[PDB]
Symmetry: C3
Subunit: 600 residues, 3 copies
C-alpha cells in the first residue's frame, strides 16, 4: 500500500490525509489540510466538467450551472459565503430552471448563502433583446406561493455587467437582484453597470420581507434605449429596509425621461446619503393598495435624507391609491437635508421639474390619495432660470397635508398645478415663512403667479410668502382662481421687495373675505379727506375693502401741511377710513401703499 499512499496523496482525498495543527500548537485540533480548505469555498470548487476538471471562465463559457451548483451545495450545509474570484469575468449564458423560471431568473439565491463578488459577472448575448432577472430569491413562479429568502448577502468589490443589451420589447422586465420575500438580505459594495433594465435591485414582495438594505453600491448606465418602458434602480417593497450611501449615474437621454433612483413602497423605509446624476426622478414614496398584503395598507416612517441630486424631472414623488377592497395611505414622511438641482435643459424638454410632486395614481386619478403628515425641511433646490417648468411643489392630486419649513427653493414656481387639468382638494398645506425663495428666476415670470393655487379648494392651509429680492415680472405672488374655494387659511405676503408690484395677492373670487380667512398683503389705495382743519378723516375712493380689519401705511408723507392716517379701519360700504391731521384745512387727495390686514 505505499503505492496506495502515493496514490491516496495524488487523489482528490489526498489533502484529507495530510495532517495539520494550527501554528504547531499542541493544544490545537489535529486536523487534515482538507478540513482547513473546507472552511472556505469558491466558484472554482464547482466550475468543472463532468470528470471534475476545472473549466476556465470566458465569453464562450456559460458559468450559470456551476454557480448554481455551488449555491445549492452550500445551502445544503446550512449556509456560508461563496467567493466569485477576482481577476476573472464569469459569464452567464442561459436561464435557470424551476421556481425562478417564472421570473426569467438566471441564478436562484438561497437562504444563508452569501455571495462575495470580487470578480465580474457578465451577461452573454444569449440575453440580448430578452427579459432576465439575474439573481432571484423567490423559489416559486407565483410569488404568493413562494417561500422566503433569509440571511442572504451579496457584497464585494466586484461588478455585475448587463452586457449593454437593449430591451427587445417595452413589456419585458429586467432586474439584477430580486431578493423576493426577503428577510435580512443585503447588497453592499457592488457596481451594477452597462444595461437597459427595469430595476437593478428589488427588496421584498408586496410588503413581505424585513431588514433589507442596499449600501455603498454603484449603479452606472442602466438605461440605454427608447424601448425601455421605465426604470427605477432600487424598488423597496418590504418594511424596515432602505438604501444608503449609494451612487447612481445615467448618461442616456432616455434616462432623463424615465429613470428614478429609488422607490420606497412600504413603512419604515429610507433613502439617505446618496448621490444621483442623469436621472428623471429621485425617489417615489408611494403606498400602493395593490402592494399591501404583507405589511399593511399604510406607508409611514418614510425618510428621504441627506441626498445629493442632479435630475431632470421630480425629486420626491408622493402617492397613495386604492383597489376595490384595499385603501392605501401615506403619512409620517420626512424629506430633509437634500441638495437637488434640475440639470441644464430646455424648458418642457423633460417631465415637469419639481422638488416635491403630489402625483396622481398610475391610471391618472387624482381623487384617491390619502397623503398627510409630511415634513419637508432644510432642503435646497435649484433650477436654471430658463426652466419654466420648475416648482418647489407640483400639487397635482388630492393632498391631506404637507409641511414646508426652512427650505431654500430657487426655481420658477413655489406652488404650482396646471390650470384646466386636475383640481385637487387641498388640506393642511403649510408653507412657513422660513422658506427662502431664491432669485434665479427673477425677470422671467411674465404672466405667471409665483404660488399658482390651481385647486378645487384649500382648507387649513398656511402660505407665508417672503421674497428675498425683487421680481417685478411676475403677475402676482399668489393667486387663487375663482374656482378655488379658500377657508380656514392664512395667506400673507411680506412687504419686502413688493413696493412696485401692482398685484401681490390675488383672490379672483374675493375669497379673502371668508369668515375664517386670515390674510395680509400690500396694496395701493387712493384716499381723499374732508376739508376740516385739525383731526380729519381720510376715506378710500374705492369700495372693495369691506373684508379689511386694519391697514397701515407703507409710504412716506411728502407733505408738510397735513398727514394721512397711519392706520385705517373699514366701513360697511367697503371704504377704508382713518383719522389724519390737517395742519391747515383743505380737501386732500393721496395715493398710499398700505398693508391690508384681515384678522391678523
Amino acid at each position: 500500500d505505499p503505492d496506495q499512499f502515493r496514490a491516496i496523496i495524488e487523489s482528490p482525498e489526498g489533502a484529507g490525509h495530510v495532517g495539520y495543527q494550527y501554528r504547531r500548537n499542541t493544544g490545537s485540533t489535529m486536523r487534515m489540510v482538507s478540513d482547513v480548505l473546507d472552511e472556505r469555498v469558491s466558484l472554482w470548487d464547482f466550475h468543472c466538467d463532468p470528470s471534475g476538471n476545472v473549466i476556465q471562465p470566458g465569453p464562450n463559457v456559460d458559468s450559470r450551472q456551476y454557480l448554481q451548483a455551488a449555491i445549492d451545495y452550500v445551502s445544503s450545509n446550512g449556509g456560508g459565503t461563496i467567493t466569485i474570484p477576482a481577476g476573472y469575468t464569469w459569464y452567464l449564458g442561459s436561464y435557470g430552471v424551476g421556481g425562478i423560471a417564472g421570473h426569467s431568473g438566471i441564478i436562484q439565491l438561497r437562504s444563508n448563502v452569501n455571495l462575495n463578488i470580487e470578480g465580474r459577472i457578465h451577461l452573454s448575448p444569449f440575453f440580448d433583446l430578452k427579459p432576465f432577472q439575474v439573481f432571484v430569491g423567490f423559489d416559486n413562479g407565483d410569488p404568493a406561493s413562494s417561500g422566503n429568502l433569509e440571511n442572504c448577502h451579496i457584497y464585494g468589490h466586484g461588478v455585475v455587467d448587463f452586457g449593454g443589451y437593449e430591451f427587445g420589447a417595452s413589456s419585458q422586465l429586467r432586474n439584477g437582484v430580486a431578493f423576493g420575500r426577503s428577510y435580512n438580505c443585503s447588497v453592499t459594495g457592488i457596481t451594477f453597470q452597462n444595461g437597459d433594465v427595469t430595476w437593478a435591485i428589488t427588496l421584498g414582495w408586496n410588503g413581505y420581507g424585513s431588514n433589507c438594505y442596499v449600501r455603498k453600491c454603484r449603479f452606472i448606465n442602466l438605461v440605454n434605449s427608447s424601448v425601455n418602458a421605465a426604470h427605477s434602480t432600487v424598488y423597496v417593497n418590504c418594511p424596515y429596509s432602505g438604501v444608503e450611501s449609494c451612487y447612481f449615474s445615467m448618461s442616456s437621454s432616455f434616462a432623463r425621461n424615465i429613470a428614478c433612483s429609488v422607490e420606497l413602497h412600504q413603512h419604515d423605509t429610507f433613502y439617505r446619503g446618496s448621490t444621483v446624476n442623469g436621472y428623471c426622478r429621485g425617489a417615489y414614496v408611494v403606498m400602493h393598495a395593490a402592494e399591501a398584503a404583507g405589511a399593511g395598507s399604510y406607508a409611514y416612517n418614510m425618510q428621504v435624507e441627506n441626498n445629493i441630486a442632479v435630475i431632470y424631472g421630480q425629486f420626491v414623488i408622493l402617492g397613495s391609491d386604492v383597489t376595490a377592497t384595499v385603501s392605501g395611505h401615506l403619512n409620517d414622511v420626512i424629506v430633509s437635508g437634500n441638495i437637488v438641482s434640475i440639470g441644464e435643459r430646455a424648458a418642457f424638454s423633460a417631465p415637469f421639474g419639481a422638488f416635491i410632486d403630489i402625483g396622481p395614481d398610475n391610471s391618472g386619478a387624482s381623487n384617491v390619495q390619502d397623503i398627510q403628515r409630511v415634513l419637508v425641511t432644510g432642503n435646497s433646490f435649484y433650477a436654471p432660470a430658463n426652466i419654466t417648468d420648475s416648482a418647489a411643489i407640483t400639487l397635482r392630486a388630492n393632498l391631506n397635508g404637507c409641511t414646508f419649513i426652512a427650505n431654500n427653493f430657487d426655481c420658477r414656481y413655489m406652488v404650482y398645478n396646471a390650470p384646466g387639468t386636475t383640481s385637487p382638494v387641498v388640506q393642511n398645506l403649510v408653507w412657513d415663512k422660513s422658506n427662502v425663495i431664491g432669485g434665479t428666476h427673477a425677470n422671467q415670470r411674465a404672466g405667471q403667479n409665483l404660488f399658482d393655487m390651481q385647486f378645487a379648494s384649500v382648507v387649513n392651509s398656511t402660505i407665508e410668502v417672503q421674497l428675498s429680492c425683487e421680481d417685478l415680472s411676475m403677475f402676482s405672488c399668489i393667486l387663487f382662481p375663482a374656482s378655488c374655494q379658500l377657508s380656514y387659511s392664512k395667506i400673507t405676503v411680506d412687504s419686502a421687495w413688493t413696493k412696485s408690484m401692482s398685484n401681490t395677492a390675488v383672490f379672483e373670487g374675493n375669497q379673502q373675505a371668508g369668515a375664517n380667512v386670515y390674510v395680509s398683503y400690500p396694496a395701493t389705495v387712493n384716499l381723499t379727506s374732508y376739508n376740516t382743519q385739525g383731526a380729519v378723516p381720510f376715506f378710500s375712493t374705492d369700495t372693495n375693502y369691506a373684508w379689511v380689519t386694519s391697514a397701515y401705511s407703507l409710504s412716506i408723507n411728502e407733505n408738510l401741511d397735513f398727514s394721512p392716517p397711519a392706520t385705517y379701519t373699514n366701513k360697511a360700504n367697503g371704504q377704508l377710513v382713518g383719522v389724519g391731521y390737517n395742519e391747515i384745512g383743505g380737501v386732500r387727495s393721496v395715493s398710499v401703499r398700505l398693508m391690508l390686514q384681515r384678522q391678523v
Copy 2:
C-alpha cells in the same frame, strides 16, 4: 525513514512538510502548506478534546473553553481574527473564570483579537434564570483595577441568541458585549436576539474608552418578562463613540414600559440613522456625576440624528446630576432629522409620551440638573388623537436652556409639566415661530392648555405660538399659573385660527405686566365712545389693560355712520383708548377683537 516520510505526512506536522509557492511564481516565498493555513484561524482549531480530536458543536456541547483557548492563543501572537464558522450553532454552557467572573462573564475578549461571527452563538439552559455577560473586555472583577481592551472588533453575518430565558430576579444584570475600558472596539453586522437582558452592548466604563461603535447591527426581542427591571440596548459610556445604522425591535408588552434603544453618557457621542420599533424610549442623553471619572464631568457634543422610531414613551430624555463631590453637566446637544411616532396605545397606558423629556435624576430630584445649549430642529413627531399623555416636551426638572426650531409636532401638548408635581426652574427655553403645531388632537383638548407652563419660574424664554388649524376645545394656547414667575421673556400668540377662542394667552398672576415681558395675543374688548361728531375717542369698559402698549383691530366694522379706532393705547386706569370717527354723532358701543401688544 521513507516510513517516517509517510508517517511525517499523516502526522499533525505533515502540512509543514508539503512545499508551496504562490501561483508557481519563482519570485515568491518557498513556503510550506502549514504556513499558508496558519494565516487564518477558526474555532475549529481549538474545538477539540484532550487528544486533539475535533468535537462537533451542538446543544449538549459547551463551546466556551474552546473559544476562550482560541482567543487566548491568538492574543499571545499579537492578535488576529478568529472565525466562528457559518453553518453551525456554537453553544455556551458555563461561566468563564478569572477577571470576568466578577461580571458574570462567559467569554473574555482580548486586545487585537477580533471575532468574525458567521455562525450562531447560543446560550444553553445553564443560564436560565441567571445573570450573564456574554463577552467581557474587563480583565479584573473591579473595573477600576481593570486593564484596557483595545482594537477588538466583533463582526459578521452571524447571530448571538440569548436562548429566550427570563431573568430570575430583577436585581440581576445581563449583557451581550461589555467591551470594558475599551479603545477602538466595535460591533458590526451582528444580530442579537431572543432574550431578556439589561443591555445588548455596552461601550466604555465611566468615561474610560474611546472610538467605540455599533454599526449595522440588529437587536430583536431582548425583553420578555415582568422580572426585567430595565433595558437599554446600547449604553455608550466612553467618548468619541456611537451607534449608527442599526435596527431595534421589541414585541413584548414589557418592552413598551421599560426598554430604551440607546444611552449616550459621555461627550462626543452619537446615535444616527437607526430604526426603532416597540420600545418605550429612544435615547437617554445624560451626564451622570457617578460616571465622570474617565472623561470629565461634562457631556457635550451629543448628536441624535436622522432616526426613525415608533415608541410608547419618550424619544430623547435629557439629564444631569451630582454626587457629593462631582457635578455633571449636559450641554451642546443636537436632536435633528428624526421622524418619531407614539405607537397605537390607550392614554396613560405607558410612560408619558414625549419627543423631549427633561427628566429628574434617578432619585427623582429635579433641582440638580445643568442642561443647556440644546438644539432640537427639523424633527417630526406624531401621536394619535386619543393619547392625552403626549407632548413635544415634558419639562419636569430644572432646565438651563433648550432651543426648538423648525420642527413639526403633532400631539396633545406642546410644552407640558404636571401641576402639583415638580416646579422646575426654567431658563432659555426657546420655541421659535417656525415650529409647526399639527391638528391631530384638535377637538380633544377640553380643559387643557396647549402650552401648560407648570413651572416655578420662566426667564429668558421665548414662546411663539402659531396654530395651523382651529382647536376651539382647548382652554388656552398658553397658560401661566400664578405660582410661575415670568420675566425677561417673549410670549406671542399669532392670531390665525384664534378668532373664536375665548382665551388665547392666560396669565393667572398678571405676569404679562412685568417690566421685561414682551407679549402679544388676541382678546375681545368692549368699547364705548363719547357722543361727539367727528374724531371721537373710544374707551374700553374694562380696566385690565394697564400693561398694554398698543392694540389694533382684528375685526371688521359693520357700521356706515362711524368707525372705531384702528389702533389703541392705554391710560393709567387700565382702560384702552383710541381715536375713531363719528360721521354722525352719538355714543357708540362695540365689541371688537384686538391684538393686544406689550412692548412688541
Copy 3:
C-alpha cells in the same frame, strides 16, 4: 521516482501534487491544494530573500520591495486583495522607483489591487526630516502624463504609523495615500497616526477621478512641529467622492493653528457624520481655477452634514478664484446638522473663530470670488464667552449669496468683517428670523456691533435680528458704516429684549432712507402736543424721521388725562406726527419707545 515523489512533495511544487475536492463532494472540482491556497495572497508570499527563504519583518528590515513585488504580481493577474498580516509591524525604509519617484513615493498602487491592512505599517527613520508619500497611485512623475488608478481599495483594522518624524523643511510634502487620477478607490477602517504630514489621504487630481471615498477611518496626531506649513487630513480633488463616518484628532498646539480635517475641491462631494477634535478648521469648500482641468470650473453639490467638531478657527471656509484663463465658481452648497464648538482658548490666540468663513484667495484677493446658492441650516455653534474673535460668519471676500435658516449661533458676533481690511461686495446674504442668537456673550460686547456690516456694499440681503435675551453691553444690534452702500434690502430688529438699548440698528450714512430699503427697529422719541382739548396731534421734537413710513408705541401711557397716539406717520420736515387724545387740554411732552417702520 518514489524518491522523486517524496522530493516533489517537499519541493515548492508539492502542494500542486496533493489532491483536494471540496468537502468530499463528488460533484466538485478535482483540484490540488496549491489551487486553493492560490485563491488568497499575503505579503508573506513575497517577503523573502533571493533564495526564497521568508524574512521576518521588523525595524531593521525594509519591507518596501516585497510589498511592491506583491502588488506588481497581483496586478499582472487582473487584480485581487493582498493581506498585510495581523500581529506584525511591517517597516518601510526606502523610496520607490519609477513614476512614483517624482512624488517622493514609497509604494505604487495598481489598479484592481486591494490592500487588506490588518497589521501595522510603520515608517523607518530613513524618512526622518524627509518628504514622502506612502502609497501613490500616479504612474508618472508628471500627474498630467499619468495613467489612472482604478478599483483600488485599502481597508482593514490595521494602522499606518508615520513614525513621529518631524518635517525637515516647510516646503516639503508628506502624504499617506495619494490615489492619483483615481476612479472607484477607497480607504475604509484604517488608523493613520503619529506623524507630521501635509495630508493623510488625497483623492483625485485636478478634477480627474470619480467615486473615491474615505469611510470609518481614524486620523490621530498627524501634526507635531512648527516646521509643518499646513495640514489637511483628506483633500478631495475629484467629483462624486467624499468622507463619511471618520474620526479626526490632534493634540499639538500647532494643529490648532494649521490643521483642517477635510477639503472639498470638486463638485458632488461630501463630508458627513464625522467627529473632529483639536483642529484649526473643519472643512474648506473651494473651487480653485487651478484645479479645474478634469471636472470643470464649478464646485456644485457640496455637502457638509451631521459632523461633530471642536476646533480653534473656522468650521467651513468657502472660496473660489481665478487664473488668467479659467474662472472658478462655487454654488449649490449645503451645511446642515453640524454641532460645532470653538475649544477653550484665549481670545485672538488662534485664527478668528467662525462657523462660516468667506475667505479670500491664497494670495489674499477678495474680489475674485463667485460664491452663491449656499444653504446653512439646522446647525449649532458655540464659542466660550471670552472668545472675542468668534462669529457665525466672517464675511471677508466678495459674496454672491449665502442663506442662513434655523441655526443656533452662540458666539460674539453674528456677521463680522474687520473694519479697515477688505471691503467685500455682498449680494443675497439672507439671515432668516429663525436663527437663534444665544446668550453666552451677553455683557461682553462693549464697543461692539452684533452684526458688524463692514462691507463695501450690501444688496438683495435680509437681516432679521431676533434676540433671545438681553445684552445691554453691545453698542448696537446691527451697524452699517457710512462707507457701506445698502439697497434693495430688508433689515429688522425685533423689539424683544431691546427696550433698554440706546441703539438697536445704526445706519451711519442714513442708508435706511434708500428707496428700496425695508427696515424696522425700535427707537426712543420725544414728542410734544398741541394744547387742544380732544383729538390732538403729537409731533416729534427731532426731525430725523423723513424715511419713516409708520411707527407705533412700544410704551405704556402712565397718564389719565391724555394719551399719545398709538401710531404715527411722518411729515416732510422729518417729524413724526400722530393723533392722540387730550381728555383735558394742555401742551403735553412725552418720551416714548416706538417701533420705527419703513415700507414694512
